[PDB]
Design an enzyme around this catalytic site. Structure first.
Site, PDB file in Angstrom:
ATOM      1  N   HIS A   1     -11.858   5.946   3.356  1.00 19.49           N
ATOM      2  CA  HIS A   1     -11.658   7.254   3.567  1.00 19.49           C
ATOM      3  C   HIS A   1     -11.609   8.359   2.687  1.00 19.49           C
ATOM      4  O   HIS A   1     -11.298   8.274   1.551  1.00 19.49           O
ATOM      5  CB  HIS A   1     -10.327   7.513   4.737  1.00 19.49           C
ATOM      6  CG  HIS A   1      -9.275   7.324   3.730  1.00 19.49           C
ATOM      7  ND1 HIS A   1      -8.582   5.887   3.953  1.00 19.49           N
ATOM      8  CD2 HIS A   1      -8.093   7.893   3.155  1.00 19.49           C
ATOM      9  CE1 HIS A   1      -7.419   5.895   3.384  1.00 19.49           C
ATOM     10  NE2 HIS A   1      -7.345   7.251   2.774  1.00 19.49           N
TER      11      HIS A   1
ATOM     12  N   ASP B   1       1.036  -1.090   0.034  1.00 18.47           N
ATOM     13  CA  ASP B   1       0.014  -0.112   0.111  1.00 18.47           C
ATOM     14  C   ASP B   1       0.858   1.095  -0.045  1.00 18.47           C
ATOM     15  O   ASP B   1       1.633   1.366   0.962  1.00 18.47           O
ATOM     16  CB  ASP B   1      -0.856  -0.111   1.235  1.00 18.47           C
ATOM     17  CG  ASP B   1      -1.669   0.993   1.177  1.00 18.47           C
ATOM     18  OD1 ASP B   1      -1.785   1.755   0.532  1.00 18.47           O
ATOM     19  OD2 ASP B   1      -2.658   0.983   2.043  1.00 18.47           O
TER      20      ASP B   1
ATOM     21  N   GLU C   1      -7.292  -1.831  -2.497  1.00 18.96           N
ATOM     22  CA  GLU C   1      -7.645  -0.457  -2.523  1.00 18.96           C
ATOM     23  C   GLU C   1      -7.480   0.181  -3.706  1.00 18.96           C
ATOM     24  O   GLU C   1      -6.435   0.338  -4.401  1.00 18.96           O
ATOM     25  CB  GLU C   1      -6.810   0.392  -1.682  1.00 18.96           C
ATOM     26  CG  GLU C   1      -7.179   1.698  -1.342  1.00 18.96           C
ATOM     27  CD  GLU C   1      -6.376   2.408  -0.161  1.00 18.96           C
ATOM     28  OE1 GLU C   1      -5.263   1.973   0.126  1.00 18.96           O
ATOM     29  OE2 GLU C   1      -6.795   3.301   0.586  1.00 18.96           O
TER      30      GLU C   1
ATOM     31  N   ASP D   1      -3.988   6.828  -3.050  1.00 22.64           N
ATOM     32  CA  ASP D   1      -3.897   5.936  -2.117  1.00 22.64           C
ATOM     33  C   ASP D   1      -4.581   4.490  -2.896  1.00 22.64           C
ATOM     34  O   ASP D   1      -5.675   4.661  -2.956  1.00 22.64           O
ATOM     35  CB  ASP D   1      -4.672   6.305  -0.925  1.00 22.64           C
ATOM     36  CG  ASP D   1      -4.433   5.231   0.213  1.00 22.64           C
ATOM     37  OD1 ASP D   1      -3.825   4.294   0.121  1.00 22.64           O
ATOM     38  OD2 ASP D   1      -5.203   5.462   1.208  1.00 22.64           O
TER      39      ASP D   1
ATOM     40  N   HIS E   1      -6.567  11.283   5.208  1.00 26.20           N
ATOM     41  CA  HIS E   1      -7.677  11.159   5.844  1.00 26.20           C
ATOM     42  C   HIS E   1      -8.552  12.360   6.315  1.00 26.20           C
ATOM     43  O   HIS E   1      -8.188  13.095   7.107  1.00 26.20           O
ATOM     44  CB  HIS E   1      -7.334  10.377   7.263  1.00 26.20           C
ATOM     45  CG  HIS E   1      -6.709   9.059   7.327  1.00 26.20           C
ATOM     46  ND1 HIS E   1      -5.492   9.201   8.173  1.00 26.20           N
ATOM     47  CD2 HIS E   1      -6.529   8.140   6.341  1.00 26.20           C
ATOM     48  CE1 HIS E   1      -5.071   7.808   7.881  1.00 26.20           C
ATOM     49  NE2 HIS E   1      -5.773   7.257   7.156  1.00 26.20           N
TER      50      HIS E   1
ATOM     51  N   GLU F   1     -10.942   1.127   0.321  1.00 28.47           N
ATOM     52  CA  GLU F   1     -10.141   0.006   0.559  1.00 28.47           C
ATOM     53  C   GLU F   1     -10.976  -0.846   1.345  1.00 28.47           C
ATOM     54  O   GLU F   1     -12.041  -0.633   2.280  1.00 28.47           O
ATOM     55  CB  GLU F   1      -9.106   0.395   1.317  1.00 28.47           C
ATOM     56  CG  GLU F   1      -9.162   1.218   2.685  1.00 28.47           C
ATOM     57  CD  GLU F   1      -8.056   1.866   3.088  1.00 28.47           C
ATOM     58  OE1 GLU F   1      -7.685   2.800   3.374  1.00 28.47           O
ATOM     59  OE2 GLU F   1      -7.069   1.051   3.227  1.00 28.47           O
TER      60      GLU F   1
HETATM   61  C1  MED Z   1      -0.816   7.030   7.568  1.00 28.73           C
HETATM   62  S1  MED Z   1       0.047   5.812   6.299  1.00 28.73           S
HETATM   63  C2  MED Z   1      -1.147   4.907   5.563  1.00 28.73           C
HETATM   64  C3  MED Z   1      -2.113   5.711   4.770  1.00 28.73           C
HETATM   65  C4  MED Z   1      -3.343   4.941   4.243  1.00 28.73           C
HETATM   66  N1  MED Z   1      -3.015   3.691   3.604  1.00 28.73           N
HETATM   67  C5  MED Z   1      -4.349   4.714   5.231  1.00 28.73           C
HETATM   68  O1  MED Z   1      -4.355   3.988   6.418  1.00 28.73           O
HETATM   69  O2  MED Z   1      -5.207   5.840   5.384  1.00 28.73           O
HETATM   70 ZN   LIG Z   2      -6.529   4.155   2.512  1.00 29.76          ZN
HETATM   71 ZN   LIG Z   3      -3.711   2.794   1.327  1.00 32.37          ZN
END
Ligand code: MED
Ligand SMILES: [Zn+2]
Ligand SMILES: [Zn+2]
Length: 354
Positions: free
Chosen positions: A207, A127, A335, A138, A215, A240
């Protein structure tokens, strides 16, 4: 023409500065005018997405058991920096390379000294993110080498695609979660002689994404029971899903590697020298984008752990430790980033791979 292995920045492959659209879908005049007015924004997302597509294709060609997690992330990140044409906060890596293994679903990337080696039976979640001007992609996939996880992977991929199909302007977030759950749980898998009904990880979610804000505030649940809050025109979402053979719940575990400044915290004067310096380094290099310890090492910083802890204790920086289900469980993730444009839904990070 891109090199193999990739070395030509995406910007240099599309000289007119116009980048390829992702998959455009109709949702489940004036709006066309409204859509065109933000073309420069969609274009930035698209540039970042093409970089993501090319990086991941490259990674899929060489990632193999035997490699250390550090080697994997450094090789991936090197390519990402090159294709996105890294330029301070105007172009770069949006957040560290997740390479979460097995029961661990998210937020693991190795720190310096990590000797972990990728194994044949590992289920690794790659990721990673790219951005142009804070327009973030993302996007994530799961890597395996043992076919025993094939159905688990297919379940999560189907769940993610369901979430993507269901998303839309005026769509209730709780409906998307219910939808995702229904598909996910329709799958049963058998791994090492045990069978499981695939479960969504209930305390993990997709998100909304904002400028330099991974986020942005709204969450996309992957089980029923969430908020009826609606998705709105112009929003961008990371859709995701995560499936697990364990409890379907994650907890903080292991050494923390991921950190990110609290988006809402303003300027804070700091006299403590090391703490002050580190905060300045973070402001200069990451702003509100997430970073990891390896990214501090690389900038030549050392003896920064107490300073980083200070920043966390102050609430200026937040730690994001690995989130893992129970020992022995297996987790998978897929995702994509989608743009809720006025005239359509664009799965901007869609590729010919997933
Ligand atoms: C905070 S770095 C990971 C970012 C993204 N993959 C999330 O968990 O929202
Ligand atoms: Zn994410
Ligand atoms: Zn991600």
């Amino acid at each position: 023409v891109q090199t193999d292995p990739p070395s030509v920045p995406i910007c240099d492959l599309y000289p007119n500065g116009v980048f390829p659209k992702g998959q455009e879908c109709e949702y489940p005049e004036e709006k066309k005018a409204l859509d065109q007015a933000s073309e420069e924004i969609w274009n930035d997302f698209r540039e970042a997405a093409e970089a993501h597509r090319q990086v991941r294709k490259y990674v899929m060609s060489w990632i193999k058991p035997g490699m250390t997690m550090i080697e994997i992330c450094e090789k991936l990140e090197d390519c990402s920096r090159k294709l996105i044409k890294e330029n301070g906060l105007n172009a770069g890596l949006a957040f560290p390379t997740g390479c979460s293994l097995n029961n661990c679903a998210a937020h693991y990337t190795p720190n310096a000294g990590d000797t972990t080696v990728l194994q044949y039976d590992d289920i690794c979640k790659i990721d990673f993110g790219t951005h142009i001007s804070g327009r973030i992609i993302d996007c994530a996939f799961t890597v395996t080498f043992n076919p025993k996880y094939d159905t688990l992977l297919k379940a999560v991929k189907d769940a993610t695609n369901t979430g993507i199909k269901c998303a839309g302007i005026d769509v209730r977030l709780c409906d998307v979660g219910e939808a995702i759950q229904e598909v996910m749980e329709s799958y049963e898998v058998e791994i090492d002689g045990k069978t499981y009904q695939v479960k969504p990880i209930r305390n993990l979610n997709g998100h909304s994404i904002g400028q330099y804000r991974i986020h942005a505030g709204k969450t996309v649940p992957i089980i029923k029971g969430g908020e009826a809050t609606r998705m709105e025109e112009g929003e961008v979402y990371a859709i995701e899903t995560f499936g697990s053979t364990g409890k379907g719940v994650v907890h903080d575990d292991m050494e923390c590697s991921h950190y990110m400044k609290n988006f809402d915290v303003g300027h804070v004067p700091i006299r403590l020298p090391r703490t002050k310096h580190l905060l300045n380094v973070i402001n200069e290099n990451f702003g509100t984008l997430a970073f990891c310890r390896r990214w501090l090492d690389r900038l030549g910083e050392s003896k920064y752990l107490m300073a980083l802890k200070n920043l966390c204790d102050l609430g200026i920086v937040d730690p994001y430790p690995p989130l893992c289900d129970i020992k022995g469980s297996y987790t998978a993730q897929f995702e994509h980033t989608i743009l809720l444009r006025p005239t359509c839904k664009e799965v901007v990070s869609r590729g010919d791979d997933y």
